Amino acid sequence: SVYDAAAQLTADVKKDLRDSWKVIGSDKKGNGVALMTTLFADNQETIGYFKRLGNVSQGMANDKLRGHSITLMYALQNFIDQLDNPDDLVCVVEKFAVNHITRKISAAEFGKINGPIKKVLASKNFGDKYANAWAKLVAVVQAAL
Amino acid sequence: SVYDAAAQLTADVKKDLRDSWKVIGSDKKGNGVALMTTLFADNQETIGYFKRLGNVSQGMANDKLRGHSITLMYALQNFIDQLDNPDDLVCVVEKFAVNHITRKISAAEFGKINGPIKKVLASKNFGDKYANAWAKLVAVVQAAL
Ligand code: HEM
Ligand code: HEM
């Protein structure tokens, strides 16, 4: 359940999320686009969900992809900002889940973002310990799907 | 169309938006809920689009309303962050409008948020000068609806 999953965000997981987000969230456009391109590269099967975006291979030059990527980074910002209060984090995660549920994105499909996060982190000198902290946060969202 | 409306965001307008946001955006949950409850109070007919939120009369105590209210504030954060780059502003505004168009929210209906914005700014002592600035940002969104 979402409440049980939120409980897995221990003190050090919260800290590692904050420390890494201080860097990653610094360049929402570049890292947001990097994330999406990585997902599309590593999991081509997911492109079908993004038909509205047009030619995703254009990367930064695709205005729709750019607008989506930037926006995705503000949902992450939201989640980091709610870490202090589990009640607030859970209501924001359930709110975020509505549209994803409507699109038929299952927990397993959503979990495909972990690879792309790990790669983006690694590109900023954040290793496994950080990739695992983020996988925990992503697991809160999966619990809601 | 959106580019033209973005052209009204002059340097003075942008400055007033950033200064007021510095205060309003510092309590996303408090101000986001005050926005929503003011909208419902002043334009009861807008509740029609929020059946999913349930008992909106509970205000902050309603988890779904709280969830939606905090999230709303990240859309404004996004917009404020893109003020210096019209190309990014426009792509984030068009991305934002997609679900609103789907919900059949017209520019006229979207404009009902202006009163609530003006009352929230005034509660923090931001006068007409500031409400006009905000009305110009809402107009960019209206141009995309
Ligand atoms: C870190 C994980 C993710 C975050 C933070 C995220 C965030 C967002 C946000 C903020 C929106 C815009 C509001 C909305 O319409 O719900 C959105 C839209 C969307 N999301 Fe997610 N997303 C993530 C992962 C995914 C994954 C893995 C998929 C599919 C496999 C997906 C599918 C979609 C689609 C198809 C849209 C609409 C795109 C458009 O047409 O503009 N998302 N996402
Ligand atoms: C400054 C103005 C506004 C901002 C920044 C804002 C922002 C947002 C955001 C970020 C979402 C979540 C993502 C999505 O589903 O699109 C959302 C959802 C929604 N918005 Fe807007 N919104 C604004 C005004 C309005 C107005 C005036 C209406 C209708 C009169 C409206 C109707 C909706 C509805 C019905 C939802 C989905 C609610 C739910 O079931 O969770 N929005 N809005």
Short mmCIF file of all heavy atoms in Angstrom, two decimals, chain A residues 17-62:
data_model
loop_
_atom_site.label_atom_id
_atom_site.label_comp_id
_atom_site.label_asym_id
_atom_site.label_seq_id
_atom_site.Cartn_x
_atom_site.Cartn_y
_atom_site.Cartn_z
N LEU A 17 18.27 11.26 -1.15
CA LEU A 17 17.37 11.82 -2.19
C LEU A 17 17.63 13.32 -2.29
O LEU A 17 17.78 13.88 -3.37
CB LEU A 17 15.93 11.54 -1.77
CG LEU A 17 15.44 10.11 -2.02
CD1 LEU A 17 14.01 9.96 -1.53
CD2 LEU A 17 15.59 9.81 -3.50
N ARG A 18 17.65 13.96 -1.11
CA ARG A 18 17.89 15.42 -1.06
C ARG A 18 19.25 15.82 -1.65
O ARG A 18 19.34 16.76 -2.46
CB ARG A 18 17.76 16.04 0.31
CG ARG A 18 16.37 16.15 0.81
CD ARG A 18 16.35 17.01 2.07
NE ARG A 18 15.30 16.46 2.93
CZ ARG A 18 14.03 16.83 2.73
NH1 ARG A 18 13.83 17.80 1.84
NH2 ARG A 18 13.07 16.32 3.45
N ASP A 19 20.30 15.15 -1.21
CA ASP A 19 21.67 15.46 -1.68
C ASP A 19 21.82 15.30 -3.18
O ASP A 19 22.51 16.09 -3.86
CB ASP A 19 22.66 14.58 -0.91
CG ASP A 19 22.92 15.03 0.52
OD1 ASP A 19 22.62 16.17 0.89
OD2 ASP A 19 23.46 14.18 1.26
N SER A 20 21.27 14.26 -3.74
CA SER A 20 21.37 13.97 -5.18
C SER A 20 20.45 14.93 -5.97
O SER A 20 20.84 15.40 -7.05
CB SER A 20 21.11 12.49 -5.46
OG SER A 20 19.82 12.05 -5.04
N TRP A 21 19.28 15.21 -5.43
CA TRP A 21 18.34 16.12 -6.12
C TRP A 21 18.94 17.52 -6.17
O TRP A 21 18.77 18.24 -7.17
CB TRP A 21 17.00 16.16 -5.38
CG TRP A 21 16.05 17.07 -6.09
CD1 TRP A 21 15.62 18.28 -5.64
CD2 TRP A 21 15.48 16.84 -7.39
NE1 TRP A 21 14.77 18.81 -6.60
CE2 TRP A 21 14.67 17.99 -7.68
CE3 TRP A 21 15.60 15.85 -8.33
CZ2 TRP A 21 13.99 18.10 -8.89
CZ3 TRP A 21 14.89 15.94 -9.53
CH2 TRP A 21 14.11 17.06 -9.78
N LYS A 22 19.76 17.87 -5.17
CA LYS A 22 20.41 19.22 -5.19
C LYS A 22 21.19 19.39 -6.47
O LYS A 22 21.24 20.47 -7.10
CB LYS A 22 21.29 19.33 -3.95
CG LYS A 22 21.96 20.68 -3.84
CD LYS A 22 22.78 20.77 -2.53
CE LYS A 22 22.88 22.25 -2.13
NZ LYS A 22 23.73 22.97 -3.17
N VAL A 23 21.79 18.29 -6.94
CA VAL A 23 22.52 18.37 -8.21
C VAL A 23 21.58 18.14 -9.40
O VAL A 23 21.54 18.97 -10.30
CB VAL A 23 23.70 17.38 -8.19
CG1 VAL A 23 24.34 17.18 -9.55
CG2 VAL A 23 24.69 17.85 -7.11
N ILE A 24 20.88 17.01 -9.43
CA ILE A 24 20.04 16.67 -10.56
C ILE A 24 18.98 17.73 -10.87
O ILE A 24 18.77 18.08 -12.05
CB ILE A 24 19.35 15.27 -10.33
CG1 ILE A 24 20.40 14.16 -10.21
CG2 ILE A 24 18.33 14.94 -11.46
CD1 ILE A 24 21.45 14.17 -11.34
N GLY A 25 18.35 18.21 -9.83
CA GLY A 25 17.24 19.20 -10.00
C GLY A 25 17.70 20.58 -10.36
O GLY A 25 16.88 21.48 -10.59
N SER A 26 19.01 20.80 -10.47
CA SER A 26 19.69 22.01 -10.84
C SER A 26 19.50 22.39 -12.31
O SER A 26 19.63 23.55 -12.68
CB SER A 26 21.27 21.85 -10.73
OG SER A 26 21.58 22.37 -9.47
N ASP A 27 19.33 21.33 -13.10
CA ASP A 27 19.16 21.56 -14.54
C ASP A 27 17.98 20.67 -14.95
O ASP A 27 18.16 19.54 -15.41
CB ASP A 27 20.47 21.23 -15.23
CG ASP A 27 20.37 21.25 -16.76
OD1 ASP A 27 19.42 21.85 -17.33
OD2 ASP A 27 21.26 20.64 -17.38
N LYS A 28 16.83 21.25 -14.71
CA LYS A 28 15.60 20.44 -15.01
C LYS A 28 15.43 20.10 -16.45
O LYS A 28 15.05 19.00 -16.84
CB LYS A 28 14.38 21.21 -14.47
CG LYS A 28 14.43 21.12 -12.90
CD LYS A 28 13.22 21.84 -12.35
CE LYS A 28 13.08 21.61 -10.86
NZ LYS A 28 14.15 22.38 -10.17
N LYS A 29 15.74 21.08 -17.30
CA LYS A 29 15.62 20.83 -18.76
C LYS A 29 16.59 19.81 -19.25
O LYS A 29 16.22 18.83 -19.93
CB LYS A 29 15.77 22.19 -19.49
CG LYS A 29 15.89 22.10 -20.98
CD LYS A 29 15.75 23.43 -21.69
CE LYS A 29 16.66 24.55 -21.26
NZ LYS A 29 16.54 25.68 -22.26
N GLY A 30 17.90 19.94 -18.89
CA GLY A 30 18.87 18.98 -19.42
C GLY A 30 18.72 17.59 -18.88
O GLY A 30 18.74 16.60 -19.65
N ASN A 31 18.55 17.46 -17.58
CA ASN A 31 18.41 16.16 -16.94
C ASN A 31 17.03 15.54 -17.23
O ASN A 31 16.99 14.31 -17.34
CB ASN A 31 18.68 16.25 -15.43
CG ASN A 31 20.15 16.52 -15.17
OD1 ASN A 31 20.45 17.20 -14.19
ND2 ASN A 31 21.02 16.04 -16.03
N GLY A 32 16.05 16.42 -17.37
CA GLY A 32 14.67 15.91 -17.68
C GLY A 32 14.74 15.30 -19.06
O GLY A 32 14.19 14.21 -19.29
N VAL A 33 15.36 16.00 -20.05
CA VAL A 33 15.42 15.47 -21.40
C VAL A 33 16.29 14.21 -21.44
O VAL A 33 15.98 13.28 -22.16
CB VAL A 33 15.87 16.51 -22.46
CG1 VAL A 33 16.24 15.82 -23.79
CG2 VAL A 33 14.75 17.53 -22.73
N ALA A 34 17.37 14.23 -20.67
CA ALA A 34 18.27 13.07 -20.62
C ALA A 34 17.50 11.84 -20.15
O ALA A 34 17.68 10.75 -20.72
CB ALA A 34 19.53 13.31 -19.83
N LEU A 35 16.68 11.96 -19.13
CA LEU A 35 15.88 10.88 -18.57
C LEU A 35 15.00 10.25 -19.62
O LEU A 35 14.96 9.05 -19.81
CB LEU A 35 15.08 11.50 -17.40
CG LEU A 35 14.94 10.75 -16.13
CD1 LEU A 35 16.30 10.19 -15.64
CD2 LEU A 35 14.45 11.75 -15.06
N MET A 36 14.17 11.09 -20.29
CA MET A 36 13.24 10.64 -21.34
C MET A 36 13.95 9.98 -22.51
O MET A 36 13.55 8.91 -22.98
CB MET A 36 12.39 11.82 -21.80
CG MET A 36 11.60 12.35 -20.61
SD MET A 36 10.40 11.10 -20.06
CE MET A 36 9.68 10.51 -21.54
N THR A 37 15.04 10.60 -22.96
CA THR A 37 15.76 9.99 -24.11
C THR A 37 16.31 8.62 -23.73
O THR A 37 16.28 7.71 -24.59
CB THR A 37 16.85 10.93 -24.74
OG1 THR A 37 17.84 11.27 -23.77
CG2 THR A 37 16.28 12.23 -25.29
N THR A 38 16.79 8.46 -22.50
CA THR A 38 17.34 7.23 -21.97
C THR A 38 16.23 6.17 -21.89
O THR A 38 16.46 5.01 -22.29
CB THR A 38 18.11 7.38 -20.62
OG1 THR A 38 19.17 8.38 -20.88
CG2 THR A 38 18.73 6.09 -20.03
N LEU A 39 15.06 6.59 -21.37
CA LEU A 39 13.91 5.66 -21.33
C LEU A 39 13.59 5.17 -22.74
O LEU A 39 13.39 3.97 -22.94
CB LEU A 39 12.70 6.39 -20.74
CG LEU A 39 11.46 5.52 -20.68
CD1 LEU A 39 11.53 4.51 -19.54
CD2 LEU A 39 10.25 6.43 -20.47
N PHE A 40 13.47 6.05 -23.70
CA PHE A 40 13.14 5.72 -25.08
C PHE A 40 14.21 4.85 -25.76
O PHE A 40 13.81 3.99 -26.55
CB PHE A 40 12.84 6.96 -25.88
CG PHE A 40 11.62 7.69 -25.40
CD1 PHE A 40 11.57 9.09 -25.56
CD2 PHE A 40 10.52 6.98 -24.89
CE1 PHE A 40 10.43 9.78 -25.12
CE2 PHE A 40 9.39 7.66 -24.47
CZ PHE A 40 9.35 9.06 -24.59
N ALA A 41 15.45 5.04 -25.40
CA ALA A 41 16.57 4.24 -25.90
C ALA A 41 16.58 2.84 -25.31
O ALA A 41 16.74 1.83 -26.03
CB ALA A 41 17.91 4.87 -25.51
N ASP A 42 16.46 2.76 -24.01
CA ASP A 42 16.52 1.51 -23.26
C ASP A 42 15.23 0.72 -23.29
O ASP A 42 15.31 -0.54 -23.13
CB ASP A 42 17.00 1.79 -21.82
CG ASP A 42 18.45 2.27 -21.84
OD1 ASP A 42 19.04 2.37 -22.92
OD2 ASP A 42 18.94 2.59 -20.74
N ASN A 43 14.10 1.38 -23.49
CA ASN A 43 12.78 0.74 -23.48
C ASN A 43 11.90 1.35 -24.57
O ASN A 43 10.92 2.04 -24.29
CB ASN A 43 12.14 0.86 -22.10
CG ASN A 43 12.90 0.03 -21.07
OD1 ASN A 43 13.79 0.53 -20.38
ND2 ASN A 43 12.50 -1.25 -21.01
N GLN A 44 12.32 0.98 -25.80
CA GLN A 44 11.63 1.44 -27.01
C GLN A 44 10.15 1.11 -26.98
O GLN A 44 9.38 1.82 -27.63
CB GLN A 44 12.18 0.86 -28.33
CG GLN A 44 13.42 1.53 -28.85
CD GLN A 44 13.28 2.72 -29.77
OE1 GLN A 44 12.42 2.83 -30.68
NE2 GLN A 44 14.23 3.68 -29.56
N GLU A 45 9.81 0.05 -26.28
CA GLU A 45 8.40 -0.37 -26.20
C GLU A 45 7.53 0.72 -25.56
O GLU A 45 6.30 0.74 -25.77
CB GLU A 45 8.24 -1.69 -25.45
CG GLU A 45 8.42 -1.70 -23.95
CD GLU A 45 9.82 -1.80 -23.43
OE1 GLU A 45 10.70 -1.72 -24.35
OE2 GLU A 45 10.09 -1.95 -22.24
N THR A 46 8.13 1.62 -24.79
CA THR A 46 7.40 2.68 -24.09
C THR A 46 7.07 3.87 -24.96
O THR A 46 6.27 4.68 -24.50
CB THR A 46 8.13 3.17 -22.76
OG1 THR A 46 9.40 3.74 -23.23
CG2 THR A 46 8.26 2.08 -21.68
N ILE A 47 7.65 3.95 -26.15
CA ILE A 47 7.39 5.06 -27.06
C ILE A 47 5.93 5.22 -27.45
O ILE A 47 5.39 6.33 -27.58
CB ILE A 47 8.37 4.97 -28.28
CG1 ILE A 47 9.83 5.07 -27.76
CG2 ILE A 47 8.03 6.07 -29.32
CD1 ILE A 47 10.93 4.93 -28.83
N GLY A 48 5.27 4.08 -27.62
CA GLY A 48 3.85 4.03 -27.97
C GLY A 48 3.00 4.88 -27.05
O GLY A 48 1.97 5.42 -27.53
N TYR A 49 3.28 4.96 -25.76
CA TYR A 49 2.50 5.76 -24.83
C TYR A 49 2.64 7.26 -25.13
O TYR A 49 1.76 8.06 -24.72
CB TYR A 49 2.92 5.55 -23.35
CG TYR A 49 2.60 4.16 -22.83
CD1 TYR A 49 3.63 3.28 -22.53
CD2 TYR A 49 1.29 3.73 -22.62
CE1 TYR A 49 3.42 2.00 -22.02
CE2 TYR A 49 1.04 2.45 -22.09
CZ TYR A 49 2.10 1.58 -21.82
OH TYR A 49 1.91 0.30 -21.33
N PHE A 50 3.72 7.62 -25.80
CA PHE A 50 4.02 9.03 -26.07
C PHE A 50 3.77 9.50 -27.48
O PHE A 50 4.45 10.47 -27.96
CB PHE A 50 5.47 9.29 -25.65
CG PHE A 50 5.70 9.09 -24.17
CD1 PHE A 50 6.12 7.87 -23.67
CD2 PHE A 50 5.54 10.19 -23.30
CE1 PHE A 50 6.35 7.71 -22.31
CE2 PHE A 50 5.76 10.05 -21.93
CZ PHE A 50 6.19 8.79 -21.41
N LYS A 51 2.79 8.88 -28.14
CA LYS A 51 2.50 9.24 -29.52
C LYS A 51 2.29 10.73 -29.73
O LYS A 51 2.67 11.23 -30.81
CB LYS A 51 1.22 8.55 -30.02
CG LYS A 51 1.28 7.02 -29.86
CD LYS A 51 -0.16 6.48 -29.80
CE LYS A 51 -0.18 4.96 -29.59
NZ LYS A 51 -1.62 4.51 -29.57
N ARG A 52 1.64 11.36 -28.74
CA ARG A 52 1.34 12.81 -28.82
C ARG A 52 2.61 13.65 -29.00
O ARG A 52 2.59 14.70 -29.69
CB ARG A 52 0.56 13.33 -27.58
CG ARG A 52 -0.03 14.74 -27.80
CD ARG A 52 -0.57 15.32 -26.51
NE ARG A 52 0.46 15.65 -25.57
CZ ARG A 52 1.17 16.80 -25.60
NH1 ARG A 52 0.95 17.70 -26.58
NH2 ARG A 52 2.04 17.09 -24.63
N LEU A 53 3.75 13.21 -28.46
CA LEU A 53 5.01 13.96 -28.54
C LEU A 53 5.68 14.03 -29.91
O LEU A 53 6.59 14.85 -30.11
CB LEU A 53 5.96 13.29 -27.52
CG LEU A 53 5.92 13.80 -26.08
CD1 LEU A 53 4.53 14.17 -25.61
CD2 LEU A 53 6.55 12.72 -25.19
N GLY A 54 5.20 13.23 -30.86
CA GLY A 54 5.82 13.28 -32.18
C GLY A 54 7.12 12.47 -32.18
O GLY A 54 7.25 11.40 -31.55
N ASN A 55 8.08 12.96 -32.93
CA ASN A 55 9.38 12.28 -33.12
C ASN A 55 10.33 12.57 -31.96
O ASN A 55 11.09 13.54 -31.98
CB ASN A 55 9.98 12.66 -34.47
CG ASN A 55 11.33 12.03 -34.77
OD1 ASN A 55 11.96 12.46 -35.77
ND2 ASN A 55 11.77 11.08 -33.98
N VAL A 56 10.26 11.66 -31.03
CA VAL A 56 11.04 11.70 -29.77
C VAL A 56 12.52 11.62 -30.00
O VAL A 56 13.34 12.00 -29.13
CB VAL A 56 10.30 10.55 -29.00
CG1 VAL A 56 11.15 9.43 -28.53
CG2 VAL A 56 9.33 11.16 -28.00
N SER A 57 13.00 11.18 -31.16
CA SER A 57 14.43 11.06 -31.47
C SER A 57 15.07 12.44 -31.69
O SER A 57 16.31 12.57 -31.65
CB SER A 57 14.73 10.17 -32.68
OG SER A 57 14.43 10.80 -33.91
N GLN A 58 14.23 13.44 -31.87
CA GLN A 58 14.69 14.81 -32.05
C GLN A 58 15.26 15.35 -30.73
O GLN A 58 15.93 16.39 -30.73
CB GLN A 58 13.60 15.75 -32.56
CG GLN A 58 13.16 15.39 -33.98
CD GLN A 58 14.31 15.56 -34.94
OE1 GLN A 58 14.76 16.69 -35.21
NE2 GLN A 58 14.80 14.43 -35.42
N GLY A 59 14.92 14.73 -29.63
CA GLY A 59 15.40 15.16 -28.30
C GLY A 59 14.99 16.59 -27.99
O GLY A 59 13.83 16.99 -28.11
N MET A 60 15.99 17.37 -27.58
CA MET A 60 15.81 18.78 -27.16
C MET A 60 15.10 19.66 -28.16
O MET A 60 14.38 20.62 -27.79
CB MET A 60 17.18 19.31 -26.71
CG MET A 60 17.05 20.65 -26.04
SD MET A 60 16.49 20.49 -24.32
CE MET A 60 17.88 19.67 -23.56
N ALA A 61 15.22 19.37 -29.43
CA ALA A 61 14.62 20.10 -30.54
C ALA A 61 13.12 19.84 -30.69
O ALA A 61 12.44 20.53 -31.47
CB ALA A 61 15.36 19.75 -31.83
N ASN A 62 12.61 18.86 -30.00
CA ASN A 62 11.15 18.54 -30.11
C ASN A 62 10.55 19.37 -28.98
O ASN A 62 10.84 19.12 -27.80
CB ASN A 62 11.00 17.04 -29.95
CG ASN A 62 9.51 16.64 -29.90
OD1 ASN A 62 8.70 17.45 -29.48
ND2 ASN A 62 9.27 15.43 -30.35
#
